[PDB]
Write an enzyme that holds these catalytic residues in place. Structure first.
Site, mmCIF file in Angstrom:
data_model
loop_
_atom_site.group_PDB
_atom_site.id
_atom_site.type_symbol
_atom_site.label_atom_id
_atom_site.label_comp_id
_atom_site.label_asym_id
_atom_site.label_seq_id
_atom_site.Cartn_x
_atom_site.Cartn_y
_atom_site.Cartn_z
ATOM 1 N N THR A 104 35.789 45.806 36.221
ATOM 2 C CA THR A 104 35.196 46.769 37.357
ATOM 3 C C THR A 104 34.557 47.936 36.785
ATOM 4 O O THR A 104 35.309 48.524 35.844
ATOM 5 C CB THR A 104 36.371 47.076 38.302
ATOM 6 O OG1 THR A 104 37.156 45.857 38.793
ATOM 7 C CG2 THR A 104 35.950 48.009 39.238
HETATM 8 C C1 LIG Z 1 37.759 46.044 43.958
HETATM 9 C C2 LIG Z 1 38.798 45.353 42.905
HETATM 10 C C3 LIG Z 1 38.254 43.913 42.874
HETATM 11 C C4 LIG Z 1 38.415 45.982 41.536
HETATM 12 C C5 LIG Z 1 38.742 45.111 40.402
HETATM 13 N N1 LIG Z 1 40.349 44.771 40.262
HETATM 14 C C6 LIG Z 1 40.777 43.635 40.433
HETATM 15 O O1 LIG Z 1 39.982 42.536 40.264
HETATM 16 C C7 LIG Z 1 42.206 43.449 40.276
HETATM 17 N N2 LIG Z 1 42.588 42.094 40.900
HETATM 18 C C8 LIG Z 1 43.623 42.071 41.784
HETATM 19 O O2 LIG Z 1 43.865 43.065 42.281
HETATM 20 C C9 LIG Z 1 44.099 40.713 42.333
HETATM 21 C C10 LIG Z 1 43.018 39.922 42.867
HETATM 22 C C11 LIG Z 1 43.226 38.663 43.394
HETATM 23 CL CL1 LIG Z 1 41.908 37.718 44.335
HETATM 24 C C12 LIG Z 1 44.393 38.258 43.176
HETATM 25 C C13 LIG Z 1 45.465 39.003 42.427
HETATM 26 C C14 LIG Z 1 45.220 40.266 42.302
HETATM 27 CL CL2 LIG Z 1 46.446 41.178 41.275
HETATM 28 B B1 LIG Z 1 38.345 45.953 38.881
HETATM 29 O O3 LIG Z 1 38.029 45.009 37.825
HETATM 30 O O4 LIG Z 1 39.059 47.018 38.577
#
Ligand SMILES: CC(C)C[C@H](NC(=O)CNC(=O)c1cc(Cl)ccc1Cl)B(O)O
Ligand SMILES: CC(C)C[C@H](NC(=O)CNC(=O)c1cc(Cl)ccc1Cl)B(O)O
Ligand SMILES: CC(C)C[C@H](NC(=O)CNC(=O)c1cc(Cl)ccc1Cl)B(O)O
Ligand SMILES: CC(C)C[C@H](NC(=O)CNC(=O)c1cc(Cl)ccc1Cl)B(O)O
Lengths: 222, 215, 215, 222, 215, 215, 222, 222
Positions: free
Chosen positions: A1
């Site tokens: 991200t």
């Molecule tokens: C807006 C958001 C996508 C930011 C980004 N974080 C994540 O992707 C972290 N991922 C999850 O929270 C998560 C997603 C799913 Cl589908 C299942 C379990 C988990 Cl544990 B980033 O790269 O910092």
């Protein structure tokens, strides 16, 4: 991200990627990470997805509620204070594995000089906030690479188009150096999302311009 | 005797309503129009409750200001609870009726207020606007054409009934409402509209040079 | 009967107001000027609420002292809550009106007070000062030119209306207010000003040799 | 446990298996894991059985209660929000060993285009929800194999029959690769359960069609 | 009717005050002098509140004893809260006025008390002593010269007004106060002083052979 | 009207006191002597509060029994709080006065009691005994010579005043008290003394053959 | 972080640096660490940034609230007591990693001798306060070096200019010996911040004087 | 830290040093550790500084409050009980690192014999108190050396001057044997502080007498 924000004469531009991962497994390909809070403010949150969406929806509702109650919108410092309080309240949940880090961009309509009215605010996990004065900022796991790219590419910014191109290039470099950041997808046709704020308000950038800029950058690098 | 107490409270509320100004809400092709006679530029009688809901009141300012704040709180909490599109004006009218009935029954002094709630359709849809009128005792009624509250409403109601025209324009409706209320320049006038053509938020005020141009 | 109780309470409040001294608030080019007739040097009737807000009261000292303290508490908590520039006099006036209405409705004895809230513009800006008057029953009104409270206000109001001049100087406004109140040396006089030209805090008192020099 | 859901032009189809295990011991052979919440929505929960049944019965009661109270049914976003709140409230019990993960399928009657009215929503353990845009989704311990099978078999879907056949094939592959998923039983005559949602509502699929499809697939693989 | 209730309560308080003894507080060059007619040696009417604050009361003993205890509690808690030098007599007078007003308004029977608070300057400083008088209804007044409470005060007030002399000595002031109160030996006399020349604590009693020597 | 309520309550308390027996407390060289006319051997009117404090009461038994228990509780908690030598009779008298005033003001029916508190000096010291009298309304008085409560006290008071002798012996004081009360054998007599010569506890009863020998 | 304060005949002078770090990474270059609480008092807090800003804003609001309520300002001992209470209340948060240590400078208007009216107060983590009598004090991670420099350079102080020069030199030595303290920046033009309190009140020092003094010191050391 | 107290015919004398340390670093040079609680009582507390000042100010306020409320001062046993309660209430904070140990000296005006009216009371960490009968007591980290010196030097005490000299000598020995105790400073001119209580009340000893006694002792030891 990775979420980037930068200033140009006339306003601000904010950009973000679309990849969501669960460890080393790719879970989401078209996630939107940039929101329009009100007519002159944009927010981008990194970390746990659910906490980010909850924070965004809550912040928007609180701003609208105050505007409807008092008949006048809040000033920029008031919005910063509200966001800082919201961040500070999640410290206990920030520990043990529910962390959200925001970044704020805005245009001040009460400033004497309309040229220098763009503001960028960064936050820390304890609730402390800082107002940027160098002209750019990045948040996320690939923020260091994007910041180092902008440090060299900032001399070319003159207007909105230049700033948007620089933001796309910084996102491309961050995706090149980090595996948790999604790069442009030409097989599927998915590109980063951008918001431009100026004296007329905050507008979403159409995807055709971003696709053209990404194709030009890819051709240049090849 | 309960009869004497209820009669005295009703008479007090009736006098309080009768010694107030007049507010008029009309339905035109573009939505709902609110017109009131208010000289002050800081105290307002017409307000917005939600995206497509508008609130009007007649009576004591400090008495319906609290009601307006409570309605905004209810709408925002319900919108965050389920969704923004699950909020309608009928629920707000019912809440106002319950609150007014409880106040009239239990409180030492009844509220001298008259409330009107207006709702329009969502963007890209066709639907008749809805107008609800709430009185001091808690009675709730539905009005299809227009609402007139406060002061001596009989001549205004008669003039509006004789002069009402469906699917009228904004200028014609404004002139008709002004003529009915007279029986009034830039000053001592408060005009608001619920624009059904607006994307998300429909409430907007018409004040200043635009009001004179449309007058 | 509720009518008799309300009439008796209103009569008590009217007598309490009528047996008090007079306070006068005027608007001049430099801001707002408060003039009161008070012999004591320890008990004050004019005070500061916030950076650009001023408070005046007429009636029983121990009754409006509590109101002044509550207003200061509200202003400081709101300023720390959001920002210093998000505090206005209209919110304070509304809070005072709600508190006075609740006291007049529920408390055994109504408060015999009359309140005035004044607000000026921020530094480096041009804006008309705002004056709000609040009565014992909770009614709130906006006054564009001047406010006179306490005692027999009719001759003072007539003199001020006949003698009021817009954009007057400090000395001329002070002399006009003194003449209106007479119809009064260093002693038995309390004079305060809200200086719109001051950077952050606008309230300041004029007492001592300066008052005699300006008189 | 494996529950699959997919979209076809006209609506959605959801399917699930029938095996319940306690470690490496088989405890149940004819468990039903797919429920009809209302006239246009279906839910499938994986994890602890008791938590799943409790969640399903509670969700149905809440939806019916709102419909009776307000005289109008909730919108799709409201149902998603209610389900997300219910999932988020079980985080503490999700840790230490009481975990339930739902999957939602539905038909939107307020959509302008009736063809693209089928919706599939997935959830995570923290309460975050995602709306699918690729056309299929799977939940459970054998979800990866089913997803990889659908990724190759999705080009054949044209109508409800094609989608049902693809869903049965995906369940068969998941049972082939995972030992906690129950395959077709020909000695006893137990087959997976399916629900089809279209413009006329949600209907349970009779067992004869599923038996015929399973027999055809088994003959093809032999 | 509220008028009749307030009148009856005021009349009760007036009778209770009128059927009591007299207390006199004077200001002389050395500070403040309290003189009361009290035969009992165990029950006292003059007390010390803080380092430079003195308290006097007239009326029912069990009614102002509670007020004295409350005032001491307020002063000690405020002194520990901020500092010893941040405590003044005006705050104590305001607290007493608020408490007396609340008692007169809410309690079934009003308090039949009259209170006086005296304050002197700190060591090594020059400042006029301050005297505040508080009545049963909560009214607070500032007296520059002397305070007379309890019983028939008109002859005593007239004698003090005709005989008062500024910057008088201790013996002359004591004799003048005694003569005014007569219009009284070692017995049935209570004399206290606030010595402005003392370093930290200013309150001290004059009883025994010294009182006779000074009489 | 508050006047009528207070007058009626005072009259009720006066009748209740008047229809009761008589208790007499005297001061002699050895300390304090309590004499009461009580036929019952199980219900007592004279009691001990602390090491050198004695309690006497006239009126309804169940009404002052609670007061006696409360006084013992206060004394023991204060003695454990600071020290045994920091407990005096004046504090107990003040507590009793406050409690009686609160009961007379708030309770539906006033208490028909009359209380007396006596205190003597510590061992090895010379000091005059102290006697305090508390009435139903909360008034507290200090008596130097004797206290007579209950019934018709005027003839007893006159006889005691004519016959009182300072520094009298135990037998002479007992005979004088008995003669005054008559205007009474082993039965229907309750006699107690506070022996100032005792080391720690001073209260002791004189009943049986010793009472007849001293009579 | 290093904040110094010292006394000169006529008043007090307080100075502070501008570097903010997150471990070994530089995060902020122009942070302001010195505040003007009221007309005659200045405060400087070291430690966590958010706690420091919160403490400063709270202290200022409390002082203003008391002044408005009572109509008279607090005495110096009252302000010291309020600050000590505020520090003592954060002991639990001071442990586990949210620590703030203040330093107070002021001018007493009630003192008999106007020359000896400057006061410097230091605090400890448990809430204990001490009034300095040697004429100087330093707080922060580089306080030892600054104190050792002032111990030798204090004999030159005669008036405000001498004291300001000594304070700048002490800050320069602290930055020389400590890597968490920011030195003068000549490429960017960022210099420490100073406040001077005397009988006329508390005034911020313009940046030109500090730049001139820093340039003179750098030339002398070269 | 070392505080000594001893009895002479006519009254009591209490003395204390001025050093404050933070580990092995010297933090304070002129700290005052002896207070005058009322007209006939003195207290000296060792341990954490903030707790000591808080305890002292609280004890003084409580004594004054009782005296004003009841119109008569407390007896000696009551004061001992109040101090013991205050000490007992801090047991939980005494553990984990906030410990304060007091020592009390006083003159009893209700005693039959005015010669034997001086009282010395010591306390323990659990709230137990003891009345000394040997004529001297010491508290602090260097109390053992001071007690052993007084055990040999007590035969010389005849009046106030002798007792003061013995107390200064005991403090000197304690500073000689302990590094956490401050000795006389001749370069700066800082000496221990003493309070003398007799039938006329409690009086602070002027510094000239203590300086003369310290110089005489230093000359004798040389
Ligand atoms: C807006 C958001 C996508 C930011 C980004 N974080 C994540 O992707 C972290 N991922 C999850 O929270 C998560 C997603 C799913 Cl589908 C299942 C379990 C988990 Cl544990 B980033 O790269 O910092
Ligand atoms: C709907 C549900 C069957 C889902 C499936 N979960 C389980 O079977 C887990 N098993 C139990 O909970 C369980 C069943 C029994 Cl009979 C006894 C004890 C236990 Cl511990 B799946 O494969 O994810
Ligand atoms: C006023 C303050 C800058 C004082 C100084 N403290 C710090 O810089 C500590 N740093 C942070 O708090 C911090 C700053 C950011 Cl941008 C992000 C994360 C953290 Cl964890 B000092 O040197 O003592
Ligand atoms: C009255 C008191 C000085 C007694 C003595 N105790 C101490 O000095 C302990 N020291 C601190 O408390 C302390 C002082 C500072 Cl400046 C900073 C941090 C700390 Cl942790 B003693 O020797 O027993």
């Amino acid at each position: 991200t990775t979420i980037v924000a930068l200033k140009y004469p006339g306003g601000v531009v904010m950009a973000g990627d679309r990849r969501s991962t669960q460890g080393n497994m790719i879970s989401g390909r078209d996630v939107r990470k940039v929101y329009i809070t009100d007519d002159y403010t944009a927010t981008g949150i990194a970390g746990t997805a659910a906490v980010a969406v909850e924070f965004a929806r809550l912040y928007a509702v609180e701003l609208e509620h105050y505007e409807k109650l008092e008949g006048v919108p809040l000033t920029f410092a008031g919005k910063i204070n509200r966001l800082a309080i919201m961040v500070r309240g999640n410290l206990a949940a920030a520990m043990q594995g529910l962390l959200a880090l925001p970044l704020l961009a805005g245009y001040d309509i009460h400033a004497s000089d309309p040229q220098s009215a763009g503001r960028i605010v960064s936050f820390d996990a304890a609730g402390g906030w800082n107002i940027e004065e160098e002209g750019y900022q990045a948040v996320g796991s690939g923020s260091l690479f994007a910041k180092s790219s902008m440090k060299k590419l900032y001399s070319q910014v003159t207007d909105g188009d230049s700033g948007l191109r620089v933001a796309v290039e910084a996102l491309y470099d961050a995706a090149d150096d980090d595996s948790a950041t999604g790069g442009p997808d030409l097989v599927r046709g998915i590109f980063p999302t951008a918001v431009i704020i100026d004296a007329d308000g905050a507008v979403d950038v159409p995807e055709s311009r971003i696709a053209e800029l990404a194709r030009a950058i890819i051709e240049s690098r090849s | 005797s309960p009869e004497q107490a209820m009669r005295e409270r009703s008479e007090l509320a009736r006098k309080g309503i009768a010694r107030a100004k007049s507010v008029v809400a009309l339905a035109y092709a573009g939505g709902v129009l609110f017109v009131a006679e208010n000289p002050s530029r800081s105290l307002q009688k017409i307000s917005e409750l939600y995206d497509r809901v508008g609130f009007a009141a007649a009576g004591k300012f400090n008495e319906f200001d609290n009601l307006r704040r409570g309605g905004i709180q209810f709408a925002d909490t319900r919108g965050y609870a389920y969704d923004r599109r699950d909020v309608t004006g009928r629920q707000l009218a019912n809440v106002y009726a319950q609150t007014l009935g409880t106040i009239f029954t239990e409180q030492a002094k009844p509220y001298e207020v008259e409330l009107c709630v207006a709702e329009v359709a969502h963007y890209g849809e066709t639907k008749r606007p809805e107008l609800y009128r709430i009185t001091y005792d808690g009675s709730i009624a539905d009005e299809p054409h227009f609402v007139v509250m406060g002061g001596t409403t009989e001549p205004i109601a008669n003039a509006l009934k004789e002069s009402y025209a469906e699917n009228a324009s904004l200028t014609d409706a404004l002139r008709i409402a002004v003529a009915a209320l007279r029986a009034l320049g830039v000053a001592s006038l408060e005009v608001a509209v619920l624009d059904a053509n607006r994307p998300r938020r429909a409430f907007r005020r018409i004040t200043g040079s635009a009001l004179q141009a449309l007058l």
